[PDB]
Paper text:
We were able to produce and refold Bd0427 (aa 21-353) using dropwise dilution of 8 M urea-solubilized inclusion material into a buffer containing either β-octylglucoside (βOG) or dodecylmaltoside (DDM) detergents. Refolding, as judged by heat-modifiability, allowed purification and generation of several crystal forms; herein we focus on the best-diffracting C2221 form (2.8 Å resolution, statistics provided in Supplementary Table 1). There are five Bd0427 copies in the asymmetric unit, forming an unprecedented pentameric OMP; from hereon in, we rename Bd0427 as PopA (pentameric outer membrane protein A). Distinct from a regular cylinder of uniform height, strands 1–4 and 14–16 are shorter, creating a “flattened edge” 20 Å high on the inward side, considerably shorter than the 55 Å outer rim. Consistent with this, the inside of the chamber is lined with hydrophobic residues contributed by the barrel surface and lower face of loop 8. During model building, it became apparent that this feature exhibited strong electron density, into which we could model ten octane molecules, representative of the tail of βOG detergent. A second region of difference density was located behind the α-helix of loop 2. Refinement verified that palmitate fits the density well, with the carboxylate contacting the side chain of the conserved R88 and the acyl chain situated opposite the bulge created by the disrupted β-strands around S189 that opens to the bilayer. Fatty acid binding adds to the features (general fold, β-bulge, plug domain) shared between PopA and FadL. The three small α-helices of the plug, along with R32 and R43, prevent any potential channel through the barrel of PopA. This closure can be quantified by analysis with MOLE17, which confirms a constriction point of 0 Å.
Here we show that the major OMP of the bacterial predator Bdellovibrio bacteriovorus, PopA, differs from this architecture, forming a pentameric porin-like superstructure. The pentameric assembly is radially organized around loop 8, a folded-over edge of the barrel, making a chamber at the centre of the oligomer. The pentamer has a central chamber formed by the association of five loop 8 peptides that is open to the periplasmic side of the bilayer; the chamber is effectively shaped to the dimensions of a lipid monolayer.
Numbering used by the authors:
A (entry chain A), B (entry chain E), D (entry chain B): 1 to 240, 241D, 242 to 333
C (entry chain D), E (entry chain C): 1 to 333
Write the structure that this text describes.
Amino acid sequence: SKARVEALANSRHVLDFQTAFDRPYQFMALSEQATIEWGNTGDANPHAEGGFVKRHGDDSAFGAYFGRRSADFSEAVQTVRDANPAFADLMFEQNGLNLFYASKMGEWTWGVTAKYSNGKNEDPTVGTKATSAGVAVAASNGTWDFELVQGFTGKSELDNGTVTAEVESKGLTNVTVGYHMSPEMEVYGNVKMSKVEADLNGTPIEVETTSYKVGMVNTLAKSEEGNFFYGVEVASTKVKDDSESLLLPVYMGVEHNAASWLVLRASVAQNVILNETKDDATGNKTDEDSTRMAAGAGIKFGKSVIDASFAGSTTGVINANNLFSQVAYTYTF
Amino acid sequence: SKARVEALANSRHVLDFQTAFDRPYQFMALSEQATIEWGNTGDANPHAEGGFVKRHGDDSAFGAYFGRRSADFSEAVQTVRDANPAFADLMFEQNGLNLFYASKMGEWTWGVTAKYSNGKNEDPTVGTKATSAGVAVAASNGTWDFELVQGFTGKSELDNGTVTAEVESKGLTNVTVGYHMSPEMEVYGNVKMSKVEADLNGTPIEVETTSYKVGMVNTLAKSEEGNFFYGVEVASTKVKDDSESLLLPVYMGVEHNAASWLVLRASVAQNVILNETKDDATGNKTDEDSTRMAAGAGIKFGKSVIDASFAGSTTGVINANNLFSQVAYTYTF
Amino acid sequence: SKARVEALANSRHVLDFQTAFDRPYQFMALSEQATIEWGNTGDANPHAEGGFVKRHGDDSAFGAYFGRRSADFSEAVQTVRDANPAFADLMFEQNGLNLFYASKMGEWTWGVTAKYSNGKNEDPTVGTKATSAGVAVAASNGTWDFELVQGFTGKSELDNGTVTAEVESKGLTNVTVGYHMSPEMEVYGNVKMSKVEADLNGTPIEVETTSYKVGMVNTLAKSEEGNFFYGVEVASTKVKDDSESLLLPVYMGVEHNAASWLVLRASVAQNVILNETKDDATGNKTDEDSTRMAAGAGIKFGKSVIDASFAGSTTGVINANNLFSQVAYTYTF
Amino acid sequence: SKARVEALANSRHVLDFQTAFDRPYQFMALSEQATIEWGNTGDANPHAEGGFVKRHGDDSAFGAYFGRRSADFSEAVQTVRDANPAFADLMFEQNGLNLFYASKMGEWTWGVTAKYSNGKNEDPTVGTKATSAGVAVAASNGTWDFELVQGFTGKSELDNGTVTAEVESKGLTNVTVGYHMSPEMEVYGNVKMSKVEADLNGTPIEVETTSYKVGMVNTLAKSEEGNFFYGVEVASTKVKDDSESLLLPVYMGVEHNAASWLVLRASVAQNVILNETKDDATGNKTDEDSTRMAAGAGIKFGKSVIDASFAGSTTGVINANNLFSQVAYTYTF
Amino acid sequence: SKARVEALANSRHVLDFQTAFDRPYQFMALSEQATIEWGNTGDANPHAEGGFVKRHGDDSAFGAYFGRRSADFSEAVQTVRDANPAFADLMFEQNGLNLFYASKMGEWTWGVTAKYSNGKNEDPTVGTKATSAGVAVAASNGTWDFELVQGFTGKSELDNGTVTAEVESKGLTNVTVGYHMSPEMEVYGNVKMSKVEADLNGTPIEVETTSYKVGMVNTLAKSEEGNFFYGVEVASTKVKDDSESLLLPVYMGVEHNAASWLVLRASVAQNVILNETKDDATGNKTDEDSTRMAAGAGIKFGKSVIDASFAGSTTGVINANNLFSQVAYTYTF
Ligand SMILES: CCCCCCCCO[C@@H]1O[C@H](CO)[C@@H](O)[C@H](O)[C@H]1O
Ligand SMILES: CCCCCCCCO[C@@H]1O[C@H](CO)[C@@H](O)[C@H](O)[C@H]1O
Ligand SMILES: CCCCCCCCO[C@@H]1O[C@H](CO)[C@@H](O)[C@H](O)[C@H]1O
Ligand SMILES: CCCCCCCCO[C@@H]1O[C@H](CO)[C@@H](O)[C@H](O)[C@H]1O
Ligand SMILES: CCCCCCCCCCCCCCCC(=O)O
Ligand SMILES: CCCCCCCCCCCCCCCC(=O)O
Ligand SMILES: CCCCCCCCCCCCCCCC(=O)O
Ligand SMILES: CCCCCCCCCCCCCCCC(=O)O
Ligand SMILES: CCCCCCCCCCCCCCCC(=O)O
Ligand SMILES: CCCCCCCC
Ligand SMILES: CCCCCCCC
Ligand SMILES: CCCCCCCC
Ligand SMILES: CCCCCCCC
Ligand SMILES: CCCCCCCC
Ligand SMILES: CCCCCCCC
Ligand SMILES: CCCCCCCC
Ligand SMILES: CCCCCCCC
Ligand SMILES: CCCCCCCC
Ligand SMILES: CCCCCCCC
């Protein structure tokens, strides 16, 4: 679930339905299961999602998933929307669909995820259309992880007889390699590039981001009760003619099976030493407080698990108005 | 209960007091029971409802229910009311009454549900009259379902000193055939034709709707624990000289006995590939997000069960203000 | 408790401290107990109340009770108060007092309940005075029930230097006879007449109401777990030179011992076929939706029991701002 | 705790840290304990309080307590504060301190409580000073209770350079004698005389109240489950040249050990027959509804007990916004 | 955790991750653990914090901690911020880092805590820079405690082209000596000295504070369940040419293992006899109510512990809006 992965800091050691989309060999290690992210239709946060992963014989898995929206796509569209209130109708991805398949052939597991979305409102006063398509291919043997995420299409446009807007992807590539020395240690490198082009009612805009990350994650000698982990990552991010950040996030956390009905999840992070963002023009530096934490739970009823975030975590409260948020339901067959 | 059927995506595999009305042979399969939908008198959502089903012989069942309102009826009345604040007194069905009977004679079980409602307010500053009457007849032998739902009468009129308005069913027919190749699989076909004439203070309105549906719902090999299910339905709807939609809803869900006191219910759906509503005049297409989900619980105290929806399901939360809504109570003798 | 009798639809099969006032032989059948209705002093809904019933020998019972207000009295007083904001201080009964006694001679149990109240505020800007006095006499042998409720005095008057109002009872009789063919069935009939004169700042008013009720109540074989009941009653009410009503309420409900700590209560009722009120002046008829339900609970700690209503029953909701209302506390010795 | 004594209607039969201050022989009967009344610093209701009682030999006890304020002192200061917003800074007792000591010398237990308070704000725009001092001496032998409570100093004054105010005790004496015919019955009498003077920016005021109470309280035979009790008291109060009241409070209640973790407490009272207050000037009588109840719990964890009032009692609700108020914590060593 | 230390009156008898920073030998006595203080990034209260302590051989411990902010530093910044809204951006410490180490050398355990922080916003409209560095050195043999906390750097400054502001530490020294006659008694003394200089847009300011404290703290002979404690301390504080105070805080509390899943924490305090603050200029004295209390809880799931304050402690309530605040999560390996 999203709440689980978030409380676990999105760390690379985590195995989850939600991390498998972009690491599809993981679909082969997951238990057959159905999961539903609670939320609403349309422009809603959380947005309703859900799907399943099934085993097909001994050496492969497959499944489908409804409603998943790309982080990059939704960010771009929201930036346009926030630019001018006339762009309020610019679409997020409509009816997102994922298909995925994984197979273990001897010592290597490989997998593939396909992403497609498409929709339109041809009402003249709205006049919107959006499409996306992409793929993730990956393989692993326990020691080596190879992950490739490639966007094919990402476009959203608006034209209502008053204004016009559009935003489009001119390339999305995410490549990751991981090396696991032992079941407790992993090191990883990652390179990401996206090009986005927008036209807001005449005015063109471009954004090009390139980011390099090198990191390591450690876990403890496997406990039957507590997965404790810690990590360090160096992250270099260049927005063309905008800015450049060099960040050293240090993080740590735990997933603890605290009771027959309860999993507790918590983690904390801070950028240690390296926290600067520099302006390409002025060279002025922003270097501000970055300490952050996360907390959530799982309520276990055997095959049924209700995951959530502690809604009060950012304010330090557990109280009946601030209990669970980002709820998901997972049934493991 | 309503909340249970809704958390299970209204799938045809469900057997429930609330699914029995329009599939009256089901009344012969339910355990003798009394059920009450929490709510209020009058123009309230939820509206108070309640009834029972009792075994007559070893091969028949019968009972009565109070307060059921037709969905078609309430939609028509509410559309009219939304037309203009002058029509805010247009009545919904008053004092709904249902009687139903079911008998297993051979390998064929058959059943009948009669619905009637009638009310009026003759205060001159109000002056309103509403009536409805309908039947449902059905039979099944486990392999084949035949269900017919017939509207005989539906009329609501408003005549005060200032404005008039009326709305009236000119025919409501609903026919379903189902085939069960096994206990796990059903295919079903459904045809629905309805015509509605209304008068909004002189101006006349006419809406005619025909829909064709073909679908399949599968359940896993029956276990004492977790009823998982998925279905595919293709649905053509034609509103005369108005619009045409062709939708392919896909859904899955689970009913799990999570604890001796706890039933958990969840489901997710999306229109896959086919999601278009075309406007008749312009030919403009609407193709927008369809993802939706549902979550509910049953709290179990032996013969008493309290059913509910997770009120926070559309916003992803569970907390003191968003725990249980659409509550119902059922006593199984 | 009030919430218990309300959740059990006020049915005549109920034995409760709260149904005994107007059926005083019941005080012989109750267990020695002290009950308290949570509320406030003064013009508060709910109003603080409470009393006890104690055994004297094996053949008599007696007790006293504080705070009880007559339904008819408060209805009268509220009608006046609503007539105009200047009658806003017209009093309800002040410091209600009830005393009661019951004795079982041979096969007959008889009892009497005395009600008296009296209060005044002689502040010149308030200037109010209210008094009431009445009695209940009843006998029963298990098969026949004879109940007389007689009002002696009921007056409430207000005179500040600005306006005057007074309401006064000119007669209040209630006679009920019940017949029990078995412990599972009861038929009964009831005549009630009441006359009330009021003066609102000069305008005189008279209301005279006469009602006849014949009804039936059945329970299922006395069980040790679930007490299911249903009833039918036809009720004719005449308000002289105002209104006539003929109503056929049908109701049904359950009291279930759902756990060692929990009693669940629920009922639903509707006017079936007969639901008509006709203005005597115009002959205009009102015939509007009458479906209604009620839900409550008892939290059991051996000799302590906390009764309540599901505060969210009318909205279909159980959450943390809508849990228990109408709380009462009963200690059974 | 305050909530405990309050839920038991302040009955003379109760033994509690909070009743011992003015009945110091009780400090010898209490179990060594530490109690903390939850609250805030300053002009806060509830105000933080806390202290302890400790045994010395087998025949003596002593202890201290922080934060206690006199009801008469707070009544006086609040009345002045309410006379005029200019007097808003008039001080309640500051840093209240109690020392107490009890000893048993044969059949007689005796004890004394000393109360001191003192504080000032010499800021010229506040200019406040307040002081109090008093003693309680009492002795009991089981059959006979002698309690004397004597004020010594009671003064609060304000001089901010724009208005002056002061209020001052001219004598506070309160004498009680009780007789216990048995462990179940007590009759008691009480005389209280107080004289207060005040200056409200040059206007002088006096209040001499004198009161007589004779009462009786009964409990049932000692049972380790549910201590039931009732009482009646007649009380005559004369506020010299202002008002007179004659009041006959009748009350009953229960403390029930309802579970291993739960103590339930409830009581109801009403003035019966005698409920009159007469304004001395005009002779105008006020005689209004007096019914009132109270309810609380103890949550027990062996040596730890959290006491509270049911915050929803005056409105008859129990829900997660109206759960516990007037919380206190008590550790019995 | 902070809630734990606070509910325990911040007493010197408490051993906690939060009291070790300034008593680093304690890091040798703490069990290996990770802790997270729930909160947010940036100018937030509570502020996300967290870290760990780990053993390294049998005679040493080390670890690290993110997010901690000096109370003196935050006080200085906040006072400057309050002086003028033009200083709204004056930074608190950014990305606080703590490293600590401790070693048992025979009968002596010694430890060291290093604190460093640094951040900046070079946007010309913000123009802020902040830096801090400090050390704590301490050692103990179980009988003698020696603690030195020393501030090296402490500066925060703002220059946005419109206003300037800065605050700087010209010295921070904190020495404590403690003596333990037994495991139940401790006496201690403490001297603290600090000079802070500031410039608010050309207006200079200086604040030199010196304080002395001598205290005693006691616990009872160790139970396995209920740790009770009480202390007295006398504290003299002089702010050069501004103010002085002499205060005698007396206090008392308990940490009780109330259940396998619950720790209850409560204390209360008041300044007894000595409570005066003199204005150096006018010689005027302030001497106002000082009673205060604190209540918290630990929820225990074996190695996981969720600590909190009772959010409603200052108003005496436990309800669903006021349950737990200042939450922290601790995993003991
Ligand atoms: C417990 C002692 C830790 C000392 C760390 C000193 C490293 C200096 O690095 C600085 O880290 C901050 C963090 O953001 C940066 O802002 C500075 O530019 C660095 O020099
Ligand atoms: C990643 C799975 C690939 C599925 C691709 C299906 C191709 C077309 O998909 C549908 O196209 C229509 C056209 O509007 C959309 O409305 C549907 O939602 C799509 O599923
Ligand atoms: C399937 C049951 C049909 C039997 C009802 C026939 C006549 C009922 O008369 C009306 O009953 C309604 C309730 O639906 C009342 O509200 C009306 O007042 C009656 O006229
Ligand atoms: C339940 C019947 C018992 C009779 C009550 C005694 C009659 C006395 O009435 C009192 O009248 C005074 C005023 O004179 C009221 O203030 C009291 O509340 C009454 O009890
Ligand atoms: C509208 C322009 C914004 C940028 C859009 C980038 C392309 C988005 C499409 C994502 C496809 C790749 C995802 C692989 C599988 C998955 O993660 O679901
Ligand atoms: C105001 C009219 C609008 C159109 C509404 C037509 C529906 C009225 C007929 C009632 C249908 C009842 C079918 C019997 C079984 C059931 O209870 O569903
Ligand atoms: C304001 C005047 C309206 C008239 C109301 C009738 C007043 C009569 C009150 C006494 C009737 C109750 C006596 C029987 C015992 C009981 O029900 O407590
Ligand atoms: C402040 C203006 C006058 C108001 C009345 C003051 C009443 C006297 C206060 C002195 C304290 C008496 C309490 C001693 C009994 C005890 O030990 O609790
Ligand atoms: C800008 C305001 C100046 C405030 C001056 C006081 C802070 C300077 C010293 C930093 C704190 C060092 C604390 C060492 C041990 C610890 O508590 O972690
Ligand atoms: C198995 C857990 C025991 C009870 C824990 C309750 C936490 C609120
Ligand atoms: C069925 C074991 C206890 C479950 C408690 C869950 C409540 C959040
Ligand atoms: C089944 C052990 C106790 C569960 C406590 C649940 C508290 C929410
Ligand atoms: C009596 C077994 C536990 C039932 C718990 C229900 C609470 C929602
Ligand atoms: C016996 C387990 C019952 C737990 C109740 C859960 C409350 C929501
Ligand atoms: C199993 C002990 C009784 C539970 C009482 C709960 C009431 C809310
Ligand atoms: C199963 C023991 C009692 C559970 C009480 C549940 C009420 C929340
Ligand atoms: C193990 C503790 C018993 C239950 C305590 C419940 C308090 C609300
Ligand atoms: C029988 C164990 C305690 C039940 C506590 C329920 C509190 C709501
Ligand atoms: C598992 C023992 C009782 C738990 C009670 C929890 C109350 C919130």
